[PDB]
Scaffold this active site. Structure first.
Site, PDB file in Angstrom:
ATOM      1  N   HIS E  54       0.898  -1.181  -0.019  1.00  0.00           N
ATOM      2  CA  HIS E  54       0.024   0.079  -0.212  1.00  0.00           C
ATOM      3  C   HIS E  54       0.983   1.333  -0.044  1.00  0.00           C
ATOM      4  O   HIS E  54       0.308   2.432   0.123  1.00  0.00           O
ATOM      5  CB  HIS E  54      -0.979  -0.019   1.106  1.00  0.00           C
ATOM      6  CG  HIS E  54      -1.940  -0.878   0.920  1.00  0.00           C
ATOM      7  ND1 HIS E  54      -3.086  -0.886  -0.097  1.00  0.00           N
ATOM      8  CD2 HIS E  54      -2.726  -1.822   1.907  1.00  0.00           C
ATOM      9  CE1 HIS E  54      -3.759  -1.790   0.111  1.00  0.00           C
ATOM     10  NE2 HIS E  54      -3.770  -2.389   0.999  1.00  0.00           N
ATOM     11  N   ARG E  79       6.496  -6.572   3.091  1.00  0.00           N
ATOM     12  CA  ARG E  79       5.148  -6.768   2.774  1.00  0.00           C
ATOM     13  C   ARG E  79       5.140  -6.842   1.197  1.00  0.00           C
ATOM     14  O   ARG E  79       5.084  -5.769   0.834  1.00  0.00           O
ATOM     15  CB  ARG E  79       4.157  -6.081   3.376  1.00  0.00           C
ATOM     16  CG  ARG E  79       2.885  -6.535   2.801  1.00  0.00           C
ATOM     17  CD  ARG E  79       1.724  -6.009   3.783  1.00  0.00           C
ATOM     18  NE  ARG E  79       1.266  -4.362   3.633  1.00  0.00           N
ATOM     19  CZ  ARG E  79       0.355  -4.026   4.442  1.00  0.00           C
ATOM     20  NH1 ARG E  79      -0.526  -4.737   5.314  1.00  0.00           N
ATOM     21  NH2 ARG E  79       0.015  -2.598   4.309  1.00  0.00           N
ATOM     22  N   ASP E  93      15.258 -12.739  -3.123  1.00  0.00           N
ATOM     23  CA  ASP E  93      16.616 -12.496  -4.060  1.00  0.00           C
ATOM     24  C   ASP E  93      17.582 -11.267  -3.453  1.00  0.00           C
ATOM     25  O   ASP E  93      18.546 -11.458  -3.374  1.00  0.00           O
ATOM     26  CB  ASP E  93      16.385 -12.359  -5.339  1.00  0.00           C
ATOM     27  CG  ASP E  93      16.004 -13.696  -6.195  1.00  0.00           C
ATOM     28  OD1 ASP E  93      16.217 -14.601  -5.605  1.00  0.00           O
ATOM     29  OD2 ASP E  93      15.382 -13.341  -7.399  1.00  0.00           O
ATOM     30  N   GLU E 158      -7.311 -11.046   7.442  1.00  0.00           N
ATOM     31  CA  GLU E 158      -8.309  -9.662   7.019  1.00  0.00           C
ATOM     32  C   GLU E 158      -9.701  -9.961   6.807  1.00  0.00           C
ATOM     33  O   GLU E 158     -10.376  -8.699   6.995  1.00  0.00           O
ATOM     34  CB  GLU E 158      -7.738  -9.006   5.805  1.00  0.00           C
ATOM     35  CG  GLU E 158      -5.969  -9.119   5.943  1.00  0.00           C
ATOM     36  CD  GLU E 158      -5.717  -8.273   4.715  1.00  0.00           C
ATOM     37  OE1 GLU E 158      -6.413  -7.262   3.927  1.00  0.00           O
ATOM     38  OE2 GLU E 158      -4.306  -8.615   4.086  1.00  0.00           O
ATOM     39  N   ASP E 184      -9.115  -3.610   8.017  1.00  0.00           N
ATOM     40  CA  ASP E 184      -9.512  -4.552   7.033  1.00  0.00           C
ATOM     41  C   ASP E 184     -10.559  -5.457   7.695  1.00  0.00           C
ATOM     42  O   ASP E 184     -11.720  -5.829   6.936  1.00  0.00           O
ATOM     43  CB  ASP E 184      -8.468  -5.306   6.522  1.00  0.00           C
ATOM     44  CG  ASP E 184      -7.768  -4.607   5.326  1.00  0.00           C
ATOM     45  OD1 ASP E 184      -8.290  -4.176   4.214  1.00  0.00           O
ATOM     46  OD2 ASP E 184      -6.472  -4.384   5.760  1.00  0.00           O
TER      47      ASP E 184
END
Lengths: 268, 261, 261, 268, 261, 268
Positions: E54, E79, E93, E158, E184
């Site tokens: 977000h 996240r 990675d 959520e 949420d």
């Protein structure tokens, strides 16, 4: 094929054309983007001016524009933000071979610009940084011996002072061309940046003639097509005939107005 | 002035114009630059399409182009690279309020696009991130309550299948507009992206009529004044009339040619 | 010169070399930089792999590395992060003509990769964006008609399943080459990415033979001269022989060690 | 509506407020990000200082911060890294109208700063680059005629020398405001950058009074709220009351300490 | 010193603290900047959440924020924008060792998240790219053998559905923690993201208790000291206590207000 | 642990090693990338030179390279593009503690470089910007009092003039080391940038000896391993033994040639 690429990479094709008296038609690049630079490199101009003075460019964005333009026939010219040997050396390091130096007021300043581009004994360029993009990281054979002769120095004259000193500026070895800034000249002459007054046009036309007759290349930026053609007739050899931001703005406005008119005719 | 700024920032002026039936003249932005975006925002278009599908844009470059365009009257519309709820969420978070969703083939897909733009119970948009640029970091008053109604979803129809499903697509609540891409449709129809064939033009015109007559806004990308007027006369409401990369290349080439470069 | 430039820009020289059976020596690019890409483009490799899967690249950094490499003889190949038609479309738009597609497990997936690179009726590539860097903004003459044949699709086989399906993969029209990643295969086979086991080497060698004998190009990433010559003698045609990050780290460390830093 | 936008774009609202004697409360921006700049443009400050001197900004990041701030009521002021006409012209090109010029030591330096912002005959600004973001690529009507009067030059005094020369600096036409750097002044006065000594505060307070009584706007950066209020009472007109990096660091530390304390009380 | 540096770089200190039951106080990072990330890394938080869902971050900006935070004691958690194995591979990675995976609805999805972080036979992580920043370009000794155990997977719940499936989610090996996003959840429960309702708070508290009592770490994002202490007393172990964008906006506004700007 | 981090962050470990006479082996960084900088920070060099002079770096890319290198044992040294107090202050602001200053020709220039790095009364560094990354945004305890002693100034000598002035340069307090640029020196001496002539090597060797015997640290960049070892034997203390771009180019070319040879032997 690497070998042949590097052999071919050294020659300054813009310089060669100027020395041959072949007029070179240019576009100014102020969009400061390697993406639009590549797009515009395909348009057919002889040269493209990457403006480090009055567009939001720096040595790094100059580098990416040089990389974008490289495979095209259009040749890059780079304007540093000032006649500064440190800025000039950094531009040369990333591979600039033709410089348009602003605000050159007298022969001493012109000489300083030339010397910043040449290795000893001809100038003050440092051999130690030849290993940057300039020599393609030491791949161009005999780079140090070949570099000076491929540098092309163009100096801008844009004041009454510079016009006064033009004969001495023309006498400086290594000044390959002299560019006239008509709006700045007009402003310095009391005409408020509007070059369309006889006294300003007389100054400009006389300077073009004097530069060419001295065996050097005259240059100018002029968005007015009719004036551009006049300057070419007077022997100018590097003439920039538009600016990318202006071309984009004016084309976009014309487009919005024409189609906006259509929408209005349908929905008054 | 901040309170007044934020009170005003919520309103989707593009959506309001479409709902009022005011034709909107647009330019496609593929230059993927906040600098040319600002320059073009001053040119007088009603809308600008920041292309996330076929230009080298990402959520970060969409953000800076939104910031560049913000103070100008021209309204931004963003095309995600696909009808992907994750990509849609991210574009909304940075402040996108009008989406042009590519390759919408059927009503299910149109519904999915709509639901991605709406908070529950109307959709699946995560409230988690009301706090991004979308709410101006929680400065827009009553943002959560107001956001759904200011979202404007436009869906692209690009295939014969999408055309067949048009009536059902038009029935999806929250589909505000339907855009036809003439090149892709022509390609799907067998005419190699050349839209200048009667069969393609017939399909395009009928779609524009059906869309407008269903109470929704038709959109299209065109380059010819007379064809634009025709699509306008047939009811088109969001008409993109050129592409920044094309305008720049063609102007540049015409200029060079005039000097025999 | 522009016309001649554009006439020449269309040809996929890497694809032409593979079809001619000319082995091509490559370097993997993980430095994710247009500057080191240009430097490495002058080193004498036949091809350079711009890794979009395991290096921090995106479509924008792929674009600038393509611009950097362009004037050099070395040919760029791009690895997307997955066999995703959207990602493939975006890479093609910026001018990618040779793709190395990871984790292709079966013929269906190979066909999907191919179809993503081709305009209709041969595939699902959107004509919409012929106008991006791919056509040089509509300067390459007859671009739409010429593009499909210049696309070069190479698929990676990384698992026992992919190996089992190799014969079917080889039968897919438009699969020009098949790359084996020895580390991933070794890992899937139970040998923790250590490819120096007879069972892994046996599987790799047999695959290279099968690929070449089917009329397609085998590819592989290796670091040993003698093993490279062996894979070449067995018919390999696109052999990557190192990785930029590794070459730089190992050279740097060897140098520091020589001075007892 | 484009027309009205461009008509409205020319007026320097910060300058107008200074001339009206309306005190302007500011925040320093050192985070060098167009994203946090937009966030902070919504906070309610009268002005925001985009620091090109002591934050990792350049002309390009200044441009993106100006674009971010543009729709908000908060007005941007830009500090170049030095009193350099080349840097000043590039900042003006991208649309800067209010400059905070560092290290102005005497009236000659103050005059040079002013002249760098004005077209001929008032200064040395080049008319040729008016076509950049400054005129919105030639959309602002009568830009050349209107530009000089909308430029706002603020000069920093931060040494004993500059204080000595303050009366002459105040006499320079086009100096609109004089900013005091209290930590640098303290250091130059032998007090090691701690401004909280009587001699340093006396110097600062007297200068504020003198600047205001000369008809010019005094300015200062002060993170101490009580001192900020004192300087406002003495007639200061552009007072920066915090720095974004400091506000962020101190708020974050306070937050970690308070909640860290809670975790520790639960799990000793 | 290099050998010692690399020997030390492998250990996931955040995971070790969770396993030891040491509560960890965190700050959310949405400013998407390596510069503010470094500044905030010095503030004294136990962990920092680099939000890829977000905030306008991508793999490249995650990389530079990881480099900025590296020398500080504060531990980074990333996240991704979705539970996507490709996105997870790319984050790993560049050196991510602790993931906060959004919208995990059921045990199958939790298992998929775990498997994405582990080399075979424990998962589907490609060994191909041990050579990226994750292994410090092959300098971390025994990287492949050590990597799986240092990965820390935290899953977000959520929705009401995710809540129903919590017991099964908790049974998934390799789920180290479960995070509840109160906004949420409140939204899914019908309370428009307002978590200050008994029904929402009851659901949150019971989840925290269930998670901790199953031997896993509960996490949550909260802003109130007394509620934080309550969630801590109920067993929460990774508690984010603010968001950088919010902290900065609120501090800035309070300052401006004190001067009547 | 934050506390201990910041306590440990102040000490200039490179300076401490120079003062102890411990030779420091370095690599030049011209790739201008925070990614390759981190990679190379793991290679085992004592120091890494982030080249702001002849690579496409700026203050912002220097900052990201410092952030990349920070957790590694290798210490960063930064070369500004010139001996410019404004550039030097911006580099110090982002956290540079060891500077390699180019083109120092005489003791006055050396003194100016030192003064640009020190707060009053020792120099002209502004205390007002201590709050940037240099003090970790005011987290390093007693930063202002501790900063001067941790600054490490290395000056480059690269001309006959500079060699002539070496004894006076060595006399300047705060000059910690003197670096010799062998290719530039060679060019200034008439040997065209090839340092492998007796007169150039004599000059270089004598200068190393003189610098070390004055109690200062000699430095040099030399890609020739045998010469590097000679300079170390003569008492050089900061010796850069390669350049990242060169190492990469040469390793890549060797690799392409060896495997290219294999392909050619299989398919003549």
């Amino acid at each position: 094929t690497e070998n042949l690429y590097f052999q071919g990479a050294m020659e300054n094709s813009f310089k060669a054309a100027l020395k041959a008296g072949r007029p070179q038609i240019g576009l100014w690049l102020g969009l400061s983007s390697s993406y639009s630079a590549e797009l515009l490199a395909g348009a057919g101009f002889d040269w493209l001016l990457i403006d480090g003075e009055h567009a939001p460019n720096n040595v790094q964005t100059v580098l990416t524009q040089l990389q974008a333009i490289a495979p095209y026939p259009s040749q890059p010219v780079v304007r540093p933000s000032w006649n500064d040997p440190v800025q000039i050396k950094q531009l040369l390091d990333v591979g600039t071979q033709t410089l348009l130096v602003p605000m050159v007021q007298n022969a001493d300043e012109a000489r300083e610009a030339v010397r910043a581009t040449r290795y000893p004994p001809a100038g003050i360029r440092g051999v130690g940084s030849a290993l940057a993009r300039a020599s393609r990281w030491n791949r161009i054979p005999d780079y140090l011996q070949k570099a000076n002769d491929q540098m092309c120095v163009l100096v801008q004259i844009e004041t009454r002072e510079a016009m006064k000193n033009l004969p001495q500026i023309l006498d400086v070895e290594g000044v390959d061309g002299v560019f006239i800034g008509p709006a700045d000249l007009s402003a310095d002459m009391g005409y408020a940046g509007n070059p369309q007054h006889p006294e300003v046009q007389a100054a400009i036309e006389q300077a073009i003639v004097q530069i060419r007759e001295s065996g050097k290349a005259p240059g100018i930026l002029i968005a007015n097509e009719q004036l551009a053609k006049r300057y070419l007739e007077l022997g100018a050899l590097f003439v920039a005939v538009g600016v990318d931001t202006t071309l984009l703005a004016r084309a976009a406005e014309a487009l919005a107005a024409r189609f906006g008119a259509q929408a209005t005719a349908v929905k008054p």
